[PDB]
DNA sequence: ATTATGACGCT
DNA sequence: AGCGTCAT
């Protein structure tokens with residue numbers, strides 16, 4: 001009872017940009033705004049592969065991973081923007097730069113963890129304590145939460161979406177105890193006020209809209225974020241967890257969408273996250289290992305301890321290209337030329353990184369995939385990265401992979417290569 | 431013939 | 442160190 005810690009110590013938010021690459025292209029080209037739109041890489045094969053989709057186009061069934069020609073079948077008026085091509089490959093620099101714009105705004109409010117190109121976790125615990133001090137026990141007006149949903153409300157005792165949103169918000173605000181500066185629900189509420197301000201700042205200063213989740217830990221904040229997209233934020237309280245999880249498929253929780261989540265379902269004979277509460281911690285550890293078992297035991301009760309890491313910059317800088325089917329590389333000249341193309345993009349990105357961020361990579365990882373191997377990487381080898389020089393990096397990558405070529409002929413490469421990947425790692429301050 | 435990345439756990 | 446998983 002009283003000693004049962006409830007995972008309510010922290011206020012954590014997850015901010016994710018809506019259809020991010022689409023918004024970057026719509027900012028640049030106003031003709032694409034408020035239209036069914038998607039972003040594609042390449043063009044020749046089936047119109048290019050879609051990687052981002054506006055919500056207008058999603059209404060027609062267009063999704064990521066779709067070929068643009070098939071998307072056009074679902075939505076003939078779909079508008080398309082193509083990713084830049086440089087040195088024969090997709091080049092994502094425009095989106096990385098746009099991402100920096102958003103991350104620097106977020107960093108004004110709190111220290112952030114860059115989780116991907118378009119999402120960051122925010123630990124708001126201290127900022128909430130400060131705003132609470134300033135409030136002096138003043139209640140929180142619904143005007144301060146104009147885009148916030150309270151998950152699970154309204155309950156009990158209407159037809160429009162905004163009306164439902166406001167009804168639930170009113171129930172939540174009416175039940176708040178604002179004289180208690182340590183009430184977790186009040187703390188989450190103040191956290192949501194701050195996130196409204198953060199999202200307003202991002203949109204004012206970049207033009208980009210985003211969604212957000214506010215809860216007591218990273219997993220719940222990320223799930224909350226997905227509940228009301230686009231351009232809205234969602235508060236998931238500790239108390240909302242039993243009902244939310246009672247019908248939540250296990251695969252919806254971050255890290256359970258793959259083989260481990262499938263094993264949870266199959267071994268335990270369950271479907272929903274809340275069913276996990278009926279097992280002891282030792283039972284879960286027996287099936288899924290000590291770490292996963294402890295994590296699952298806490299997570300199905302809404303509890304997770306993973307910290308928001310103070311990290312705004314990526315830990316690695318990499319360049320990769322697939323060479324599918326008949327485009328697979330089968331000569332030494334080919335392999336060398338593409339290693340050079342990748343290495344030249346890498347050099348450019350690394351030099352700009354060193355100038356911006358006062359650090360230098362020290363290790364080069366070379367990964368290849370060979371024809372007939374279904375794995376992502378067939379082989380990974382590291383070497384030293386001592387100079388930011390594309391010719392040296394590509395020569396070193398060749399040296400560490402060249403023993404793969406099973407061809408007796410010097411000129412031929414067998415079996416042919418269907419992927420090259422160069423990744424700079426192990427950064428040191430410079 | 432999804433593709434291009436990135437984080438992180440295991441041994 | 443090199444490989445596998447999860448993500449998207």
Ligand SMILES: Nc1nc2c(ncn2[C@H]2C[C@H](O)[C@@H](COP(=O)(O)NP(=O)(O)OP(=O)(O)O)O2)c(=O)[nH]1
Nearest residue numbers: 016017018019020021022051052053117118434449
């Ligand atoms: N190169 C590449 N980029 C990708 C891929 N998948 C996503 N991206 C890029 C394009 C995406 O815009 C961006 C962010 O990924 P999300 O948050 O997963 N999707 P979004 O922000 O579009 O929609 P939502 O409103 O539902 O969050 O990453 C991929 O497979 N390859």
Ligand SMILES: [Mn+2]
Nearest residue numbers: 016017018019
């Ligand atoms: Mn997004």
Ligand SMILES: [Mn+2]
Nearest residue numbers: 016116118119
């Ligand atoms: Mn994202």
